[PDB]
Amino acid sequence: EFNILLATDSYKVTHYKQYPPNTSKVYSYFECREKKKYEETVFYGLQYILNKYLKGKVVTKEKIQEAKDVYKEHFQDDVFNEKGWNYILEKYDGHLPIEIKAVPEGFVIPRGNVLFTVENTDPECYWLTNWIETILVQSWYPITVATNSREQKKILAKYLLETSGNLDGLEYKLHDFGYRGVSSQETAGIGASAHLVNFKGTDTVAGLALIKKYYGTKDPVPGYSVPAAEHSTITAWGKDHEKDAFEHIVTQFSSVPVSVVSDSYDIYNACEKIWGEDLRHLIVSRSTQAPLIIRPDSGNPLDTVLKVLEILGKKFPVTENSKGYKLLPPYLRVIQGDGVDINTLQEIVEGMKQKMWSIENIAFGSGGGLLQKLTRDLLNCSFKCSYVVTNGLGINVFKDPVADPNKRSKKGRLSLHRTPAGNFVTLEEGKGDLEEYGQDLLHTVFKNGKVTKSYSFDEIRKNAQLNIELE
Amino acid sequence: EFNILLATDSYKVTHYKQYPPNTSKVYSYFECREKKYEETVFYGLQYILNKYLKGKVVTKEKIQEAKDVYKEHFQDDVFNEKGWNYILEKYDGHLPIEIKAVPEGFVIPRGNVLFTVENTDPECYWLTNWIETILVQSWYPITVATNSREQKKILAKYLLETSGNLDGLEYKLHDFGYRGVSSQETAGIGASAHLVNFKGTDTVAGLALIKKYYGTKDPVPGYSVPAAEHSTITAWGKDHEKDAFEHIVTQFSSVPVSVVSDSYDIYNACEKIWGEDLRHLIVSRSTQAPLIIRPDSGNPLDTVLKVLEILGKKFPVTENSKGYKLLPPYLRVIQGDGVDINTLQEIVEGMKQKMWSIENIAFGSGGGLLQKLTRDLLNCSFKCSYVVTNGLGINVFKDPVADPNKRSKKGRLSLHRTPAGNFVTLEEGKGDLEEYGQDLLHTVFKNGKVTKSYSFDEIRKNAQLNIEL
Numbered sequence: 001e002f003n004i005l006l007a008t009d010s011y012k013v014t015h016y017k018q019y020p021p022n023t024s025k026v027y028s029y030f031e032c033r034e035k036k037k038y039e040e041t042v043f044y045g046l047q048y049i050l051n052k053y054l055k056g057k058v059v060t061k062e063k064i065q066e067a068k069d070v071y072k073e074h075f076q077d078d079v080f081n082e083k084g085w086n087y088i089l090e091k092y093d094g095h096l097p098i099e100i101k102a103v104p105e106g107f108v109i110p111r112g113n114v115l116f117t118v119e120n121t122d123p124e125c126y127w128l129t130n131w132i133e134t135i136l137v138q139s140w141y142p143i144t145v146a147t148n149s150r151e152q153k154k155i156l157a158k159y160l161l162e163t164s165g166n167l168d169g170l171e172y173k174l175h176d177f178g179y180r181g182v183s184s185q186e187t188a189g190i191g192a193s194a195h196l197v198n199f200k201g202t203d204t205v206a207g208l209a210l211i212k213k214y215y216g217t218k219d220p221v222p223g224y225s226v227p228a229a230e231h232s233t234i235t236a237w238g239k240d241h242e243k244d245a246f247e248h249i250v251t252q253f254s255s256v257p258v259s260v261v262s263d264s265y266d267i268y269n270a271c272e273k274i275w276g277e278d279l280r281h282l283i284v285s286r287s288t289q290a291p292l293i294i295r296p297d298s299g300n301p302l303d304t305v306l307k308v309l310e311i312l313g314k315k316f317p318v319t320e321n322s323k324g325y326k327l328l329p330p331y332l333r334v335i336q337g338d339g340v341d342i343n344t345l346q347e348i349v350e351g352m353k354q355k356m357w358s359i360e361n362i363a364f365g366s367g368g369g370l371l372q373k374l375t376r377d378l379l380n381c382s383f384k385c386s387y388v389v390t391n392g393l394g395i396n397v398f399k400d401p402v403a404d405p406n407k408r409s410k411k412g413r414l415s416l417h418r419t420p421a422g423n424f425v426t427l428e429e430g431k432g433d434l435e436e437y438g439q440d441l442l443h444t445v446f447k448n449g450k451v452t453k454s455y456s457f458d459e460i461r462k463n464a465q466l467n468i469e470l471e
Numbered sequence: 472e473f474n475i476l477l478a479t480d481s482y483k484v485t486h487y488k489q490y491p492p493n494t495s496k497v498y499s500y501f502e503c504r505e506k507k508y509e510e511t512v513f514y515g516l517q518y519i520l521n522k523y524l525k526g527k528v529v530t531k532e533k534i535q536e537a538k539d540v541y542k543e544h545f546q547d548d549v550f551n552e553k554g555w556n557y558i559l560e561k562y563d564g565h566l567p568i569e570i571k572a573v574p575e576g577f578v579i580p581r582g583n584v585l586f587t588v589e590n591t592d593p594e595c596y597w598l599t600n601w602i603e604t605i606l607v608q609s610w611y612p613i614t615v616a617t618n619s620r621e622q623k624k625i626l627a628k629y630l631l632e633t634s635g636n637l638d639g640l641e642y643k644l645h646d647f648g649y650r651g652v653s654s655q656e657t658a659g660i661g662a663s664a665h666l667v668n669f670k671g672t673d674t675v676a677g678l679a680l681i682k683k684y685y686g687t688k689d690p691v692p693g694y695s696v697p698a699a700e701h702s703t704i705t706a707w708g709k710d711h712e713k714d715a716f717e718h719i720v721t722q723f724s725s726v727p728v729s730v731v732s733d734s735y736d737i738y739n740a741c742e743k744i745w746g747e748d749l750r751h752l753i754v755s756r757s758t759q760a761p762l763i764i765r766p767d768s769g770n771p772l773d774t775v776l777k778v779l780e781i782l783g784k785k786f787p788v789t790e791n792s793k794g795y796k797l798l799p800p801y802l803r804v805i806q807g808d809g810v811d812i813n814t815l816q817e818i819v820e821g822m823k824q825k826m827w828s829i830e831n832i833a834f835g836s837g838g839g840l841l842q843k844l845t846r847d848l849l850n851c852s853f854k855c856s857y858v859v860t861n862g863l864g865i866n867v868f869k870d871p872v873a874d875p876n877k878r879s880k881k882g883r884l885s886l887h888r889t890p891a892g893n894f895v896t897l898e899e900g901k902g903d904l905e906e907y908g909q910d911l912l913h914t915v916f917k918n919g920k921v922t923k924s925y926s927f928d929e930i931r932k933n934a935q936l937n938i939e940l
């Protein structure tokens with residue numbers, strides 16, 4: 001069973017002995033620190049952490065003893081704050097005396113703003129605020145996935161609008177292929193759920209259960225897929241029987257969309273000769289609701305996409321849409337699911353536009369690029385103490401390292417406000433209390449072991465919409 | 472609760488309908504495909520087998536749940552209820568799969584078979600690749616362990632050159648990555664992988680994972696010591712940095728203690744606070760209880776060199792038997808900002824050029840150690856190489872025309888010693904010709920049971936550096 005006493009960085013076990021004596025409050029905050037592009041971030045994923053790990057009776061006698069035993073060996077010394085943890089157990093029935101205030105999930109906030117704050121509600125538990133830094137800072141991951149996914153959605157939207165005149169299909173243009181390429185089952189669920197804030201297509205099934213349990217949607221599920229081959233279901237037929245494999249598969253899935261990986265031996269042959277001639281009769285008969293989606297999976301992503309489109313355009317009846325861009329017939333589409341990240345996605349869509357191909361023709365699958373190739377440094381997600389009370393006096397505190405001003409942290413009690421122009425500003429030093437800037441946008445989401453405000457996944461999606469979608 | 476029927480890539484739900492009719496066997500393998508990182512540490516499969524694959528993993532409830540979810544997720548009825556019911560009825564929900572693998576901790580060159588998977592019941596031909604997704608996640612502990620080991624090689628080389636021995640090597644790269652990974656589960660897995668090579672960790676999650684799934688003779692596999700963070704310094708107020716330092720080293724007077732010293736001005740903290748105001752509290756400390764000064768900002772190499780230069784003018788430096796400068800034994804440095812395999816190399820090489828022993832320093836690495844890694848680094852990949860259809864075995868593979876690096880292996884595979892004592896993977900069942908001795912893979916899973924396993928102590932032995940051996 002999960003034990004919050006064992007869910008911190010080891011050195012934090014020793015910090016209760018290091019704060020100034022007579023300290024009754026430690027108040028800390030999280031931001032995606034600004035850095036001398038990712039100018040705005042989607043706040044998402046705290047609700048998961050609150051419910052799974054922080055709420056309810058999280059301290060028991062057994063958990064305290066277990067931690068005491070582990071730490072004695074891990075430190076070769078007795079340093080664990082058993083008294084501090086016993087107090088929470090006895091006084092609060094093992095509920096954490098902590099209050100967390102946060103911006104609403106799905107909100108899109110510029111870098112360098114407070115996104116949530118944490119403080120102790122009982123003077124005895126001044127040490128608890130930063131005990132839970134480690135677990136709360138892991139919110140960096142769903143924030144960063146959702147943010148990076150949304151930035152890709154902006155690129156797709158821009159190019160789809162330019163080449164087609166509308167945004168139809170946008171929310172199916174970046175499909176999550178990341179389940180095998182992440183570091184754990186738990187990460188799979190969290191990361192897939194964050195991508196679903198922006199899109200509806202996922203093969204990372206773990207995301208669906210997470211959303212159902214911690215967030216909820218009006219619709220039965222938040223994300224969808226359709227049938228598709230993998231190399232094994234093609235290559236199993238034997239090298240001389242690729243056409244047989246293709247025929248069997250598209251016939252099995254004749255009335256729903258089906259994607260078919262086509263590069264097992266020679267992607268160009270497969271497009272021009274197998275699909276474009278031998279099996280063309282099985283493609284041009286398909287419904288607009290049930291296209292074949294051809295999947296190249298190797299070679300330079302841009303060069304291969306363009307060559308695949310050029311081959312298909314010569315074997316199938318292409319039209320020119322009202323923006324002047326080429327469009328495959330509706331029963332035929334392409335998906336690029338190799339080597340896709342935000343940089344190569346941009347390269348591909350720009351290359352397509354230069355060669356007069358509509359973005360209507362393509363979708364993208366992204367695995368490691370979408371869910372794994374991200375770190376806490378991308379958005380500088382960071383948790384710092386800004387305010388303490390010692391001997392009954394509040395003190396505004398911060399770091400400001402001489403050799404790196406980008407690591408300077410905020411001072412005092414913080415609040416998040418709308419500016420007169422409708423942007424965001426974080427007020428420091430308790431200045432929010434002057435009430436010159438309207439209401440604080442941070443809301444209490446956790447207090448004394450209880451989750452006090454929750455958001456549905458539908459609300460989060462609404463909050464995270466693109467301006468272009470709003471327009 | 473975990474449900475293996477919901478733990479695959481969606482499209483795999485549809486594959487049972489796509490294989491050739493009358494296919495009775497699908498056999499697949501995992502490798503770190505060949506294209507730096509020439510050899511990989513195989514680690515982490517035992518965790519997956521035990522937590523997710525063994526025992527009764529199918530129930531009526533789990534089948535119904537998957538049926539209900541897939542109906543909505545595909546907007547259609549495509550789920551193989553019958554196949555999963557067959558496993559439930561015939562095998563009490565135990566997977567009819569056999570997995571063979573190289574021993575955990577083994578260090579194997581790229582492009583070799585590391586494990587194989589096949590169905591043991593012809594009805595379950597579709598199950599081999601259903602579990603690709605979950606098994607391929609082994610890429611992560613393999614990659615963390617391998618990259619951690621590659622850093623240990625760098626540290627060993629430079630420590631040996633500058634000190635003449637490897638004393639303290641296994642405490643020179645400390646895991647700081649708990650907050651910088653993507654989940655609690657990943658923290659445990661990744662921290663465990665780093666501990667194949669080192670003994671220092673702050674990622675406590677790794678200890679319980681090792682104890683549960685692998686085991687050590689010692690009570691714990693990894694260790695830490697007290698240290699400050701910026702909050703326990705800055706809480707004292709900007710004009711009281713010295714007071715915080717004094718309090719902290721006094722509370723931890725007889726054990727090692729690390730104190731982050733760059734909250735306001737690292738150079739001032741080193742030269743004036745530690746080097747003058749509090750010098751008497753440092754020079755009095757035991758060799759078993761040094762102060763470990765931690766810079767945490769600025770260019771890592773330049774800052775480390777400047778911190779050493781400052782300390783070397785305030786404290787009594789010696790010259791070791793190799794001619795390198797050594798701080799007194801009560802004083803050390805740890806650099807735990809911006810450390811990855813590349814910057815680690817730059818720092819130890821720069822220290823060497825300035826005649827500073829690597830005895831002086833340790834490194835903490837967070838994101839660089841546990842998060843900034845992907846499946847592409849070692850090209851960890853799972854592919855079908857053999858099928859039986861209509862009673863006939865066929866050697867199968869992919870070979871994409873534009874990328875020969877993605878060519879996969881053909882037929883039944885086995886791993887062998889060469890006459891020179893190296894590894895080779897034989898394809899096409901050639902292992903059966905018995906020209907290369909016994910297959911070095913062992914059966915580790917069969918029909919719901921884990922059939923071979925390794926302690927964490929043996930894994931560490933297998934993963935040792937040549938220089939250590």
Ligand SMILES: O=C(NCc1ccc(S(=O)(=O)c2cc(F)cc(F)c2)cc1)c1ccn2cccc2c1
Nearest residue numbers: 175177201203224225228257259293335363480482
């Ligand atoms: O093919 C895969 N999944 C099915 C799939 C089919 C079609 C689209 S699509 O984006 O064209 C699409 C979406 C959708 F929800 C409605 C559609 F009509 C069209 C996406 C996924 C696939 C391939 C390689 N992988 C490697 C790791 C994981 C995977 C997943």
Ligand SMILES: O=C(NCc1ccc(S(=O)(=O)c2cc(F)cc(F)c2)cc1)c1ccn2cccc2c1
Nearest residue numbers: 009011645647671673694695696698727729805833
């Ligand atoms: O200071 C930290 N942990 C304690 C710590 C002290 C000393 C060494 S050491 O390698 O110098 C050392 C190891 C050890 F096991 C025996 C020693 F005597 C010496 C390592 C860790 C720390 C700092 C920043 N963080 C940011 C994220 C996580 C952390 C952890």
